[PDB]
Amino acid sequence: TIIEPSLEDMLMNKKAQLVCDVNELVPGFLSVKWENDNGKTLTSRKGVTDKIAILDITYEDWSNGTVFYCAVDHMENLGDLVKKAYKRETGGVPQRPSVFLLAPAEQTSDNTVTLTCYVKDFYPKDVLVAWLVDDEPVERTSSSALYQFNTTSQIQSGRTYSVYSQLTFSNDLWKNEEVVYSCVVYHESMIKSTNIIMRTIDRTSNQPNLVNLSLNVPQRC
Amino acid sequence: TIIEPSLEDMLMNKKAQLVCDVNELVPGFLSVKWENDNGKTLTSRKGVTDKIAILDITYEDWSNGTVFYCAVDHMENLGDLVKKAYKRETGGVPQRPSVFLLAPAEQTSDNTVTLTCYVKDFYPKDVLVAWLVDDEPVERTSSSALYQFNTTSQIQSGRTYSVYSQLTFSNDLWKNEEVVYSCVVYHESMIKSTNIIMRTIDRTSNQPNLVNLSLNVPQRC
Amino acid sequence: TIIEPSLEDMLMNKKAQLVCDVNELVPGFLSVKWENDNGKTLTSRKGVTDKIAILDITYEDWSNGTVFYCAVDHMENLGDLVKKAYKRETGGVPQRPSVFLLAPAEQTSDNTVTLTCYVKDFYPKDVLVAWLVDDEPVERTSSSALYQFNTTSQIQSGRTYSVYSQLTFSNDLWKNEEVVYSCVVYHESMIKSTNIIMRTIDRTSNQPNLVNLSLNVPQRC
Amino acid sequence: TIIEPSLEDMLMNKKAQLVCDVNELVPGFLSVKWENDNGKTLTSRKGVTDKIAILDITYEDWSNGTVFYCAVDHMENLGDLVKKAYKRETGGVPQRPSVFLLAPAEQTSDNTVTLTCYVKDFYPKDVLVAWLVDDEPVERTSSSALYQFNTTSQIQSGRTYSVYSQLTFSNDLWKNEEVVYSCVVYHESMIKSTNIIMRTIDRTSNQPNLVNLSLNVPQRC
Amino acid sequence: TIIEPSLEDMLMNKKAQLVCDVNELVPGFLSVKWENDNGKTLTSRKGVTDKIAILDITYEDWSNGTVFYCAVDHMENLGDLVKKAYKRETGGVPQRPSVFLLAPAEQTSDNTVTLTCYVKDFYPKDVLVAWLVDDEPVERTSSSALYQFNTTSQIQSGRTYSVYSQLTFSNDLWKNEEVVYSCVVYHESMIKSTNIIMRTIDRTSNQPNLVNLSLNVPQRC
Amino acid sequence: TIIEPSLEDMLMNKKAQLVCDVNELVPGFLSVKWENDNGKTLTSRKGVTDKIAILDITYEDWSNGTVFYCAVDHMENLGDLVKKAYKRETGGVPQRPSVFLLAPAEQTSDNTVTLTCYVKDFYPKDVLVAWLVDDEPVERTSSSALYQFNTTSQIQSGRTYSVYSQLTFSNDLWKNEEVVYSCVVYHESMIKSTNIIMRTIDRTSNQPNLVNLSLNVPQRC
Amino acid sequence: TIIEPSLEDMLMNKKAQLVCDVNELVPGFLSVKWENDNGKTLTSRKGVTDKIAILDITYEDWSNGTVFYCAVDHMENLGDLVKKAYKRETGGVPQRPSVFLLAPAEQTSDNTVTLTCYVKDFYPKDVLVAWLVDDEPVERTSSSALYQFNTTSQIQSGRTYSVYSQLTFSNDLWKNEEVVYSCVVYHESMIKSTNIIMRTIDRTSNQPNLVNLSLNVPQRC
Amino acid sequence: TIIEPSLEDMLMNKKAQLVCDVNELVPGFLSVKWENDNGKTLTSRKGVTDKIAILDITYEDWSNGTVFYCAVDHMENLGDLVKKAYKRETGGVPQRPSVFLLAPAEQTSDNTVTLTCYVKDFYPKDVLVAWLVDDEPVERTSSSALYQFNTTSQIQSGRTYSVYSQLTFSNDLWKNEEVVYSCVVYHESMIKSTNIIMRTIDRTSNQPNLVNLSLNVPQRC
Ligand SMILES: *[C@@H]1O[C@H](CO)[C@@H](O[C@@H]2O[C@H](CO)[C@@H](O[C@@H]3O[C@H](CO)[C@@H](O)[C@H](O)[C@@H]3O)[C@H](O)[C@H]2NC(C)=O)[C@H](O)[C@H]1NC(C)=O
Ligand SMILES: *[C@@H]1O[C@H](CO)[C@@H](O[C@@H]2O[C@H](CO)[C@@H](O[C@@H]3O[C@H](CO)[C@@H](O)[C@H](O)[C@@H]3O)[C@H](O)[C@H]2NC(C)=O)[C@H](O)[C@H]1NC(C)=O
Ligand SMILES: *[C@@H]1O[C@H](CO)[C@@H](O[C@@H]2O[C@H](CO)[C@@H](O[C@@H]3O[C@H](CO)[C@@H](O)[C@H](O)[C@@H]3O)[C@H](O)[C@H]2NC(C)=O)[C@H](O)[C@H]1NC(C)=O
Ligand SMILES: *[C@@H]1O[C@H](CO)[C@@H](O[C@@H]2O[C@H](CO)[C@@H](O[C@@H]3O[C@H](CO)[C@@H](O)[C@H](O)[C@@H]3O)[C@H](O)[C@H]2NC(C)=O)[C@H](O)[C@H]1NC(C)=O
Ligand SMILES: *[C@@H]1O[C@H](CO)[C@@H](O[C@@H]2O[C@H](CO)[C@@H](O[C@@H]3O[C@H](CO)[C@@H](O)[C@H](O)[C@@H]3O)[C@H](O)[C@H]2NC(C)=O)[C@H](O)[C@H]1NC(C)=O
Ligand SMILES: *[C@@H]1O[C@H](CO)[C@@H](O[C@@H]2O[C@H](CO)[C@@H](O[C@@H]3O[C@H](CO)[C@@H](O)[C@H](O)[C@@H]3O)[C@H](O)[C@H]2NC(C)=O)[C@H](O)[C@H]1NC(C)=O
Ligand SMILES: *[C@@H]1O[C@H](CO)[C@@H](O[C@@H]2O[C@H](CO)[C@@H](O[C@@H]3O[C@H](CO)[C@@H](O)[C@H](O)[C@@H]3O)[C@H](O)[C@H]2NC(C)=O)[C@H](O)[C@H]1NC(C)=O
């Protein structure tokens, strides 16, 4: 049995859905159930399949740290109860991440270009990084067959966390057209206002004085 | 009797309040009323004073263009009815503004510095502009009124519009802060995602010059 | 009844014309009148229509703060008298604005560029901003199709005023790169010398420095 | 049970050791065993504890892709056999990775700086990265409480990989006259490529400059 | 008897005064007279001394080319009549000048600098050149004592004219300031919109790039 | 009767010719005469016409300040004597001028270009300015109509003077021939040394950028 | 017996002195003599010593190529006659040289700076090169002891010749004076106009864009 | 009798030959002889003709300053002995020479370009300079009229010396955007010192550049 954490972007609307899927498919299955910590009857809903239980959760409970239980009641497995739990690590006071958007270091001869948004020192583990091309998400922009965004794992030093996000596209488009790309960070520290943090960049508006020199001495004979 | 349009900032959360103030204070007053276009009985609420009527409106009605009526029913003015209306032009497809964040142009001497945020070609006439000093609203932060900001009036052309916004503060902070400022543009062209357009100027570092170098001396032909 | 302030540009010749238009057109009309503060018979002139009253005012009176009165004497409205007044505030000493010419705002998405001329703190409200293409006003050469200019309203911080003005044209003309533009500002604090202040821009300015090289010296041990 | 891949740095001497650890510690344990794919008796050695099996492997087998098997023979678990294996993904050919040193990310809030090393593409999933400070990787009187380094996970696209690694230290050391930092990358393609980043001060005029180098000079004493 | 042309700056207000001074002072004098071409009685007035005749002339007459006559009627010289004439060449249509601001000319030996404003190929011979420091005339400043300016004669190449004008001051103001000096050119052709043309110059305008760096990277083998 | 000062270029050979022309041509003429200050008989010569008197003068007399009187002795005018004088102001002590050669300010659009020569602070007040295209007088080369040039009049500030000289030609030549233009200033402040001061602009090459590199990988610990 | 060619600088005044000195001092001496090619009596003068014979020569004869004879008539050597000759190579039309002034190549800290003047392809072998500092000869300047100058030998390729002249002084003086230097070449092809060619140089005025970088790789152990 | 100094290039192998030629050819000749300072019998060899004496010398003697004597023993001249000597002044410490490559001298009139090599300070007054293109001697497969090289004499200020050398060729080859020209200098105080110059073009934007470098890299294979 596997559970999926509620989507962050939606909980930034004070609502979301916590689904619990069942993996014990080797034997038969009977029904899913969503219960409370005390075992009280917690109202729930049914998903596409009977092995999937959906539960609507508001920001109040999610932030407060309340723990819910998803259980499987197969006729053959009723001898035991796999009463999984949704435990959220709480405590501490949120720390605001420090976002840095780094320009690409690829040279002209290179084939593709990558933009990296790096965020450091935020305590709450859950975060989300998205990208915009000019002012529309890359996942929905018309030009979406040549952009590839990804996010790495979280590296923890002390009580805080840090991650690196990425977005890659062809060098020709980087050096041909003129648009502004933005890395958008969703984090809990910014719930009071905006609910979001952003950093923008474009080729023509960086103007870093530069000098490039390459020396090859073949030493050939 | 004067009405005030709902605050866009909170209407982006799909809810808001339309308050109705009464100006005919020269004679006495009896009661306020909030009705529909057809004159039906439209549920309302009461503000601090009896001359103030509050009405809760969702984004559905506001965007659809439904018109409400606020009326005054003074015992002496009952001969007539000042049944004001809230008319909000609806028009057609919106347009996404193109924001530009223009940097200061003053010199080392001037006592003050000014950041300009020009936002152009947004068809709907409802727009809001805020500023963030480092990551939090400039209105509330460590700055004890050290930061001031004001927005100009709107320009028209075609069926579009345009506007500027300015943030002013002493240049001592400008050259001894090492922070990142940002102009936030609340508009309804991006109601499908984020609901905000940002442009930022980063001062956390100052590496104006860069140099790259490579040197291969293959010692084997 | 609506009044129009005397043109500043004309008043930079120590002459102008204060026109008085009548808005109470729902009933009939009889005659216009231009009087003094004391109600004395102040000589006036007549415009195209009987509802338009022209009054010639010299710089002496306008600067001194003298107040004139325009009245309507309709046969039916003679019971009352809507004796309008023209009052220009004059409490202070002028201040010289610091004009700045900000960075160009290009957008290849629509192939258009806009240049912003910003006027900083100046006490007296009366100001006027015009544009020159090379050495003649933009409204002479090709304004009919290529160039469009506009100016916003004033924003008052303390006792002083600021205003933004813009000029917009195609980016293809931007690439001509053989045209210096210039914004000229008229204001009352320059009456002693030339009545204007000028600033200029050119397509080529504030551009970074880049040097790229590759060398292959084939040595021969 | 759990196995640990052979060290890449050691394997750059054409030898290494593959250790096999046992995790089924809930019941007792009897002996470890290291066998071949066919089950033949493969000579092995014993480590500090009986639950640890060490096997010496040369570069020939490791590169060829030969698979070895580690088995546990507990007196109670003899009913079954957990004959784990060591499967290495081998295909195509090594791809020369390009490594970039990204711009530093200063943060005056806590007075720290971070340098990033980004290895773009490399087919085989095995890679190692180390940081040098004037040729002083770690424990060389500097890496005690001054410099910290970590490495992220692998992000895969198509049939290639990439990774980031970071080095963090206080900005006080970042303001020294000149210090040489390097990011050596040991990859199974015998790369051993060192990329240098330095902070230099212009001599004729004093201005901060950031220099990047890539000496490939194969000069050896 | 010598005549003085009307001031151009005043005539940019459509008014001026043509003075007639008498030089035949060796014998006595009786009275001055200002007449028309036909000898008709042309009204005039008198100045400080009886030998000075003032005549008010408007813009129309001056541009049209009308010629006035100044005569002396000494009791002894009445035998003849020295009927002076004011002839102003009219010719064809005007031309505009192309104003240029040439390079500065410094002298460390004498510790002084000089700025030149060159006007090129304007047809009408009447032109005036004035200087501004920041936005006010040089002749009226706290530093006006240490500012010297002058204009040369007119060199006629073909049908057009050219003349040079300069401004000289010490080298310390030049090095240690951020003032923008401007040369203003009044001329008849540029009369419809504004009466003047302007240019600007600043110490830090055209400079060369310079990069000077040194490096020492102790590798090891 | 009018006199012409001796040419400076020839007096830089310590010899010259002082010609005396006669203007009283309304009546007849008899003979010219060249005398001394004391009226003594000063030997002279005869020019093309009897009304022209030539007198050979060396540098000694010219510099010393000696005067000479040219007189007309017409049979009818013998009643009086128009005994003109050649008075050359002398005093002070020569001051060597400073020469500045100012490059053209024009751009690639206009079809004419101009070079400027600014000579300043020459006390004797006797200068001559010439131009050389390629070490050849502009007036004796293979393109005379293709080059035009005139100098302005002196402007005096204290006891010194200053002048401007201009050389004008088409913009096509300025981009093609790649020659070395120079401005030659004849003055008496340096008779002891070379009698001229030159300033040159060289256009025989165009290497706007120059890079210097040096490597050293000592192979000795 | 040794002869010295007449000075050129003075031959540019159409006069000079050809002196012949006697070296046969081992025996006694009687008298010097200056004769013609035909042996005719050529008038001469006597110098400081009886062994030195001076002969005044004009530029007409010197250019024509006439050969003179200087002879020694010692009482003991009268048996023979050492009738030396002054033969000038006059075999073609003069060719004007092309002079190039080269800026110093010293970078910094070199303690010395050199200025080179290279003359190219002049036919007549006789030429002189001199140097001027702020337009005053180096020999008779206040800072004469701070400057050194020298001229190399002549290298003949075909029918023409070429030379290199040099001027060396301290680097600090080069970087802390802001003066203008100039190399002046005296040659015969320029007798028509100014008798000389001249090139000028200045540190600040001549400053193309440049980049200077060095890289030591101390291979320490 | 004339002698020829030993070749420096050969002496860079610690051996050479000192040839002694005889000029007293007017009378007969008998035999040559090579002796020591003391007159002792110093072994020698015979060249093509009897009048030429060859003597093999190692670096030891040549550097030490030993002086040899060459004598002629003609049957008629035996009355005297013209015992020539080979004395090389060598009393001082060697100092490294500094080599500069001055700016090219382009003469488009003749379509030629000359490069200059300048050796600034070498104490031993024996030096050799060679030019090479593409790492090939100018006299190797490049000795045709395509290239021409020469060297000037030596100029000494005090204890040191300096020289100039030139290489001339048509500028058609100079327009080839990539060729390497080098100076190699042999001198006692060193062994070899190369200095290359190239004529490249900026890759991103066309802008010719002139590069100059001195790769001291041992690079010995
Ligand atoms: C580099 O990054 C890795 C990955 O974040 C760091 O290892 C991780 O360290 C954290 C703790 O800082 C581990 O989380 C938890 O640690 C506590 C320690 O008491 C433990 O009780 C929890 O059960 C949990 O393990 C995390 O699991 C661990 N991850 C891995 C893959 O090792 C590492 O410390 C970082 N090193 C440096 C020098 O920054
Ligand atoms: C410069 O900006 C000003 C302010 O936007 C422009 O004036 C405005 O021009 C628009 C053009 O459509 C006017 O729209 C009109 O609105 C009234 C509202 O009652 C409507 O009845 C008309 O049919 C029309 O839609 C707007 O009123 C007007 N506002 C003001 C204060 O004048 C001005 O036109 C701009 N300059 C240029 C050159 O366009
Ligand atoms: C931002 O700009 C706006 C527009 O200029 C400022 O609003 C203006 O503020 C001034 C100063 O308080 C107001 O002047 C007042 O005018 C009334 C008469 O209308 C007079 O009775 C008062 O004594 C005072 O002089 C002006 O009316 C007001 N205009 C508008 C349209 O609101 C605003 O204060 C600026 N600063 C901000 C918003 O922080
Ligand atoms: C962003 O980076 C992550 C790094 O994990 C990428 O996820 C990984 O993508 C690779 C390549 O598709 C997956 O490899 C696959 O592994 C399975 C066995 O686990 C194998 O059966 C497949 O044939 C293939 O080799 C890898 O599993 C997958 N890992 C995870 C945790 O998802 C992700 O695809 C990257 N996304 C973008 C947009 O670049
Ligand atoms: C700008 O340049 C003009 C032209 O040189 C200057 O005017 C000239 O100034 C000089 C020196 O004061 C005058 O010389 C003297 O004039 C008086 C009066 O005629 C005479 O008695 C003296 O013997 C001597 O010649 C010169 O005449 C005068 N010329 C003109 C046409 O005014 C002018 O002063 C310069 N501007 C400034 C601010 O100095
Ligand atoms: C490099 O420069 C040297 C400069 O000396 C050139 O050597 C000189 O070449 C000229 C060629 O005409 C020689 O002229 C000859 O002079 C003798 C009398 O000495 C005369 O009898 C001949 O008829 C002819 O005029 C000159 O003597 C000679 N000088 C020396 C010292 O060698 C050399 O040729 C130049 N080489 C190149 C490749 O440019
Ligand atoms: C310019 O360069 C020339 C050539 O190097 C310099 O001429 C040289 O000057 C030195 C003296 O400073 C002479 O050295 C002396 O030579 C005599 C024998 O001739 C010897 O007895 C002395 O003890 C001393 O060594 C050297 O001969 C001479 N070389 C030539 C070729 O003339 C000249 O000094 C430099 N400076 C100037 C201003 O010309």
Numbering used by the authors:
A (entry chain B), B (entry chain C), C (entry chain D), D (entry chain A), E (entry chain E), F (entry chain F), ...: 225 to 445
Please quote the paper that reports this structure.
Polymeric (p) immunoglobulins (Igs) serve broad functions during vertebrate immune responses. Typically, pIgs are comprised of two to six Ig monomers, each of which contains two heavy chains and two light chains that form one fragment crystallization (Fc) and two antigen-binding fragments (Fabs). To assemble pIgs, plasma cells typically link multiple copies of heavy chains together with a protein called the joining chain (JC); however, incorporation of the JC is variable among species and heavy chain class. Here, we report the cryo-electron microscopy structure of IgM from a teleost (t) species, which does not encode JC.
